[PDB]
Design a protein around this ligand. Structure first.
Ligand SMILES: [Pb+2]
Ligand SMILES: [Pb+2]
Ligand SMILES: [Pb+2]
Length: 570
């Protein structure tokens, strides 16, 4: 089974949308490569190679391939029948795999499978080249140039195409050579962890719970603490600083008490069991936030509450929640509780050892290393957590060739994947929350904003109460990230800042209010592109700010084209 790195270059017209150039390069032998100007020529090769092919960002390239397949006697089927293709396309419209089936010799399936290398390496090509220390050509292909059918590729364009497939070829090979061969970064991460722990032990510490338990365990899942102090809402403020936790999640995984094994179900209020020290409690009650304390509770699926705001009060109706003991302890400290009704719960065996070996291994490699290998170490540490915190829904989109020659997608069969071990998801995030909320509270008089692993504060001095836990590099510590001259927060995840910058050898880094030469303007706003951010200033950054320069994908006959769309701050 050979592996190839692949790329297309396409036209931008709605009416005339087609591949004008392709390239493939053997990942294991970079001297074997081909660059052509015909999709038909490439697809003929696709059907012969019986190989695994990778495109960087399949979502785009894949639309051109499916368009060809449907026009050349292929149909979509999940069964893997002769002359059919299969796909993995999520509810979110992320592409994972196109599996093109030709037939069978004996029982051995004759097929070519296409994967998205962006799930292996979640970065743009240039960003990869820069970080992995790989040769990257300056500039780009001129997209404002007319290329009729049969257009001959110039030697410079040829160079650029080759460079693209090669950067990905070089990065993927380095990865496969570490033995990281799974479809996604997270899978590689899980596989590496499993190797260390042992399948035998893994199955014992992380058993598969029934769908029913799993459903109740996930009622306790909350995510990340994201909160803006009402005091600062939509106001231009002065100097402040930002702190960031060094690897918030691996930090919890490394040292916190976490659950393992089969849970034990109990009725009523939990009583302390040292063999089962962690628990989730299904509670019911009213509450009022204490004075001088940060809001903690968010009620997800209820008739009364707003799912997004952290609640100051139960509002005169009764709150029904499932809480990890970590969350419950925190709630009790921040709220007066009233009429507490203890319904039932689950208790778990707990340890702190489960992740040390895996983190140590890759933390070592990270500091020991540089370049590509350093980047892959980071991926391994940062991709594992996600695997414990995913829902079981793996329902996909089924492509079809539309009435007018474009592509359509219909939801397929409902389908469920077994979860890895959801209680681990619950507790890693609760501990994460505790880390952030705790610090933010200790700085109540200066706290502006929280976002999962960062704290935004008034003033420029490090508060005494956290000086002992501030470090530039130590795992799980708070790092003094940046300092701003002024800022404005519209709401959660919507704000702008003027960051102090200092030049250190040509390059520009974060400076202090005394030691600085420049101001870096930074914009954070959901759905806003890098291009649009450059248009934002302090004066215009308001609800209603609108620009018609957001690319939207449009399926047309032949493939996908990007078109300009109006984006507005709601
Ligand atoms: Pb290019
Ligand atoms: Pb390029
Ligand atoms: Pb139950």
């Amino acid at each position: 089974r050979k592996m190839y790195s692949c790329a297309f270059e396409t036209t931008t017209k709605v009416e005339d949308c087609r591949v004008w150039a392709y390239g493939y390069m053997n990942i294991e032998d970079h001297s074997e490569y081909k660059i052509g100007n015909s999709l038909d020529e490439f697809m003929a090769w696709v059907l012969k190679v019986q190989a695994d092919l990778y495109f960087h960002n399949l979502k785009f390239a894949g639309a051109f391939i499916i368009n060809w397949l449907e026009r050349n006697g292929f149909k979509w089927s999940a069964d893997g029948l002769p002359n059919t293709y299969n796909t993995i396309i999520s509810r979110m419209g992320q592409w994972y795999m196109i599996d093109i089936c030709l037939g069978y010799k004996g029982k051995r399936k004759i097929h070519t499978v296409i994967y998205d290398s962006l799930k292996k390496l979640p970065f743009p090509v240039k960003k990869i080249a820069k970080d992995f220390k790989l040769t990257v050509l300056k500039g780009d292909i001129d997209y404002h140039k007319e290329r009729p059918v049969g257009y001959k590729i110039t030697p410079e364009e040829y160079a650029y195409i080759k460079n693209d497939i090669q950067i990905i070829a070089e990065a993927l090979l380095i990865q496969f050579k570490q033995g990281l061969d799974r479809m996604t970064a997270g899978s590689d991460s899980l596989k590496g962890f499993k190797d260390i722990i042992t399948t035998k032990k893994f199955k014992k510490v992380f058993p598969t719970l029934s769908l029913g338990l799993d459903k109740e365990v996930r009622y306790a899942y909350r995510g990340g603490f994201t909160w803006l102090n009402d005091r600062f809402k939509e106001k231009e403020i002065g100097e402040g600083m930002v702190f960031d936790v060094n690897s918030l999640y691996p930090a919890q995984m490394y040292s916190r008490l976490l659950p393992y094994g089969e849970p034990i179900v109990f009725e009523g209020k939990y009583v302390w069991d040292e063999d089962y020290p962690l628990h989730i409690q299904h509670i019911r009650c009213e509450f009022e936030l204490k004075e001088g304390y940060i809001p903690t509770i968010q009620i997800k699926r209820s008739r009364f509450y707003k799912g997004n705001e952290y609640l100051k009060s139960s509002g005169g109706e009764i709150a029904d929640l499932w809480l990890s003991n970590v969350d419950l302890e925190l709630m009790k400290e921040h709220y007066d509780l009233y009429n507490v009704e203890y319904i039932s719960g689950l208790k778990f065996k707990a340890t702190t050892g489960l992740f040390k070996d895996f983190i140590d291994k890759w933390t070592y490699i990270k500091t020991t290393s540089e370049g590509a290998i350093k980047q892959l170490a980071k991926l391994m540490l940062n991709s594992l957590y996600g695997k414990f915190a995913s829902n079981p829904d793996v329902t996909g989109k089924v492509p079809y060739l539309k009435e007018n020659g474009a592509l359509g997608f219909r939801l397929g069969e409902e389908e469920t994947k077994d979860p890895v071990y959801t209680p681990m998801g619950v507790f890693i995030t609760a501990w994460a929350r505790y880390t952030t909320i705790t610090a933010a509270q200790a700085c109540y008089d200066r706290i502006i904003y929280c976002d999962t692993d960062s704290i935004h504060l008034t003033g420029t001095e490090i508060p005494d109460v956290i000086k002992d836990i501030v470090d530039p590099k130590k795992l799980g510590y708070w790092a003094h990230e940046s300092t701003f001259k002024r800022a404005k927060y519209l709401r959660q995840k919507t704000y702008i800042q003027d960051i102090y910058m200092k030049e250190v050898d040509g390059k520009l880094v974060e400076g202090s209010p005394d030691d600085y030469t420049d101001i870096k303007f930074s914009v954070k706003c959901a759905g806003m592109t890098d291009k649009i951010k450059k248009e934002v200033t302090f004066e215009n950054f308001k609800v209603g700010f609108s620009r018609k320069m957001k690319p939207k994908p449009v399926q047309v006959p032949g493939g996908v084209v990007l078109v300009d769309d109006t984006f507005t701050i709601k």
